[PDB]
Amino acid sequence: MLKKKQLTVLDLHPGAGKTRRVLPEIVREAIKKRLRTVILAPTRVVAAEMEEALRGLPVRYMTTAVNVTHSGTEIVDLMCHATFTSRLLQPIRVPNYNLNIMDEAHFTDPSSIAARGYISTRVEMGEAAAIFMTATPPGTRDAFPDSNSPIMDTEVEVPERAWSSGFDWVTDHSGKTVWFVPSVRNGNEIAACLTKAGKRVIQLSRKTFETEFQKTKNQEWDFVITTDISEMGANFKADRVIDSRRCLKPVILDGERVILAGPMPVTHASAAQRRGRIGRNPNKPGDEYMYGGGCAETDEGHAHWLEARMLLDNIYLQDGLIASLYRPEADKVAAIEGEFKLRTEQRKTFVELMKRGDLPVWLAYQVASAGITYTDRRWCFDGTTNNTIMEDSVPAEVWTKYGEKRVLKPRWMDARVCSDHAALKSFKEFAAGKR
Ligand SMILES: Cc1sc2ncnc(N(C)C)c2c1C
Numbered sequence: 256m257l258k259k260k261q262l263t264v265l266d267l268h269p270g271a272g273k274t275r276r277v278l279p280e281i282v283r284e285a286i287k288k289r290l291r292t293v294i295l296a297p298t299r300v301v302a303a304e305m306e307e308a309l310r311g312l313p314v315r316y317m318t319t320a321v322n323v324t325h326s327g328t329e330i331v332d333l334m335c336h337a338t339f340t341s342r343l344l345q346p347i348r349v350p351n352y353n354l355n356i357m358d359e360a361h362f363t364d365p366s367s368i369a370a371r372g373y374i375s376t377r378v379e380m381g382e383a384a385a386i387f388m389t390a391t392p393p394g395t396r397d398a399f400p401d402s403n404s405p406i407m408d409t410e411v412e413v414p415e416r417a418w419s420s421g422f423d424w425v426t427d428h429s430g431k432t433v434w435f436v437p438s439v440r441n442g443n444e445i446a447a448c449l450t451k452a453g454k455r456v457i458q459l460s461r462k463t464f465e466t467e468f469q470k471t472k473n474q475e476w477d478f479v480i481t482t483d484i485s486e487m488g489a490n491f492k493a494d495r496v497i498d499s500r501r502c503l504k505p506v507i508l509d510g511e512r513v514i515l516a517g518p519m520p521v522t523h524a525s526a527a528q529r530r531g532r533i534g535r536n537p538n539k540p541g542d543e544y545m546y547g548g549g550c551a552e553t554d555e556g557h558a559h560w561l562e563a564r565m566l567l568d569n570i571y572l573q574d575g576l577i578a579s580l581y582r583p584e585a586d587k588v589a590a591i592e593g594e595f596k597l598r599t600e601q602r603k604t605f606v607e608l609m610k611r612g613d614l615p616v617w618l619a620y621q622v623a624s625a626g627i628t629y630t631d632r633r634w635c636f637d638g639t640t641n642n643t644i645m646e647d648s649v650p651a652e653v654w655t656k657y658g659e660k661r662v663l664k665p666r667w668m669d670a671r672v673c674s675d676h677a678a679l680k681s682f683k684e685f686a687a688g689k690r
Contacts, residue, residue, distance in 0.1 A: 256281065257288055257354060262378045262385040264360075268401040269390040269531030274301075274358060274488065275308045281356060281386060282312055282331055290353040290384075294333040295370060297359040297487040299465050304488070305333060305358070320465070340366035343373060343570045344606050353383055359488040360387035361524050363554060365616050368563035368584065373570060376578035390531060391524035393583035398526035398550050402534030406544050413499050413547025415441055415518070417448035424545075426452050430494035433479045435486075435529045437501040437518035439675040442480040449478050459485055462677050483521070486528035494539065498529045500548035505558035505615075505671060512642075513558055513617050513669040520551040560588035562616035568595035569602050597623060604629050612685060618669040625666075632656065634666040635686035642668040646679060656688030 256263040267273050278294070285292040294309075296302040299320035306314075306321045315329035317338065332350075334342075336357070342349045355374040360367075377383040390400055399408060414422050415437070425432075426449070436442040439460045446456045457470045459481040471479060471491060479491060483502055501518035502525065508514060521529070526546065533542035554560065560580065567578045577593050579585060597605055597620075607629040608619035627634055636655070644651045644663040651663040651673070663686055665672070672682035684690060 256386055257284055257290060257384055259353070259384055260378060260381045262375055262387065264392050265386055265388045266390060266392055269528065270403045270535035271390075273388045273390075274305065278305070278356070278358065278388070279309055279312065281354075282309060282314065285354050286313065286331060289330065291350050292331040292354040292356065293339065293350075293352040294331065295336045295339050295355070295357045296333060297336050297362045297364075297367065298484070298489075299335065300468050301358060301488045302333060302335060304490075309333075336362060336364070336370050337366040340369045340373075340566055340570075341610060343369075344566065344602075345610075351377070351382065355383055355385040356388065357385070358388045361389040361391045361393070361528065362487050363557070363559050365559045365562035365566055368560060368580065369566035369570070369578075371581040371584070372563060372567045373572070373578045375581040376572065379579075380573075391527045393524070393581065394552075395524050395527065398523045399530065400527050402531070402542075403537045404534050404540040404542065406530065406534040406542055408530075408544050408546070411545050411547065413497055413545060414445065414448075415499055415501070415547075417444055425449075425497065426454065428495060431477065431479075431492065432495040432497055433481060433485065433491050433493045433532050434497040435499055436480055436482060437499055438503055438515075439482060439677075441499075441518070442482065443675075446478075446480045449480075454478050456480055459489070460675075464489075483525060483529075485532065486525055489532070490535070491532055493533055493542070495543040495545065496529055496533050498526065498544065498546045500526055500529075500546050500550065502553065503674075504553050504556075505617075505669075506556065507558050507561060507617060512667065513615070513671065515670040515674055517553075519553050520548055522552060522554055523550045526550050554584070554587050557587060558617055560584065561590055562620075564588055564590040564592070565595040565605075565616050565620045568593055569597055569605060595620060595624075601626065611690060613681060613690075614685070615669050615671045618665075618667055618672065621667040630688065632686055632688050636661045636664055638664040638666045638668065640664070642666070644668075644673050644679065644682070646673075651679060651683060653683045653687045655686075 302320045313329045314331045317334040374385045378385045454477040456478045461484045503515040503517050506516045530544045601623045605623035608614045673679040
């Protein structure tokens with residue numbers, strides 16, 4: 256695998272031991288061969304599990320998620336996918352790693368897609384080797400891959416709202432269930448319904464993942480209600496997955512706004528990863544996968560692939576050259592390579608709107624490409640009436656940094672800034688000049 260100009264897809268089935276058995280062997284061989292190596296974890300939680308798998312190997316953990324005193328003599332770095340793309344974008348020296356290992360390489364967040372594009376381009380240039388670890392590489396059509404033990408697969412109607420009757424099978428179960436929902440708001444409703452029926456429920460989403468995931472270890476629970484983030488190597492001691500088979504798809508309309516379309520079917524890759532949370536113990540056959548819909552290739556036209564091109568257009572590669580998306584996922588977007596390349600000061604603004612502003616890539620790009628500086632929030636208030644953001648069926652209101660109460664009405668409307676109460680709270684703070 257470790258020969259320059261090679262990209263290997265390590266596609267062993269979910270739970271085959273890619274992270275705990277194969278990765279340490281790759282890292283040992285890399286160190287023997289004096290390959291400057293990066294290991295890319297999708298989340299802080301996976302980063303911490305990798306430290307356990309790699310314990311004693313000389314690895315620099317470029318994350319506060321791990322408490323280790325480094326030798327200063329590691330030639331293997333571990334960081335999150337997002338950290339890699341972030342450091343590429345910033346005026347910070349990122350080593351030209353000889354070996355690029357991406358764990359949970361199916362992750363479809365923009366920074367993960369961008370990271371794959373950059374890495375696969377360096378490999379295509381003959382500059383580096385790469386290993387993408389995933390059961391479900393891009394364009395996989397198999398929602399039912401092999402498992403460590405047999406899974407009972409049942410197509411069944413799955414609730415997406417509170418219910419009073421008609422789903423006894425949900426609550427009659429005595430084991431532990433991981434339940435994939437299409438949104439935080441949908442999980443909040445199902446979670447309240449299960450809590451009312453006497454169940455102990457933990458909710459996971461991107462924003463809450465590290466804190467809340469720890470509860471799955473520290474307390475007894477009946478249900479984990481999770482968004483798609485738990486597709487990314489999150490492991491549970493569960494005997495059932497309930498899968499809505501639905502997700503939200505961000506869609507750019509007319510180059511002008513972003514809506515969260517759906518819910519609509521997940522990809523085969525997503526369904527396989529959701530299912531893949533169970534059947535992982537060869538000694539516990541008969542874990543259950545209950546699935547409420549079909550799969551479809553809903554990554555086609557999904558805004559994350561356009562956002563990945565906005566990131567890659569702003570990463571230095573060599574002179575004016577620009578990294579391509581990883582070939583198998585390159586047709587998910589219709590983008591002119593280099594169309595999103597920004598001049599130095601607009602690029603810095605773009606980066607800061609994402610890193611400090613916590614804005615979605617697309618919205619950060621609209622603001623930066625308009626020549627607005629990071630701290631200039633006038634655009635959060637001067638949009639069309641139809642861009643009015645609503646809070647409890649009334650226009651959301653903030654006090655501007657000038658001390659004026661205004662309706663939140665952004666010039667560019669990205670549905671991700673108000674997809675749930677926490678998102679809207681964060682965006683209100685942004686519009687008020689509080690970060
Ligand atoms: C961005 C970096 S580089 C780096 N190197 C070593 N340790 C680190 N931890 C302990 C904070 C980091 C972080 C977070």
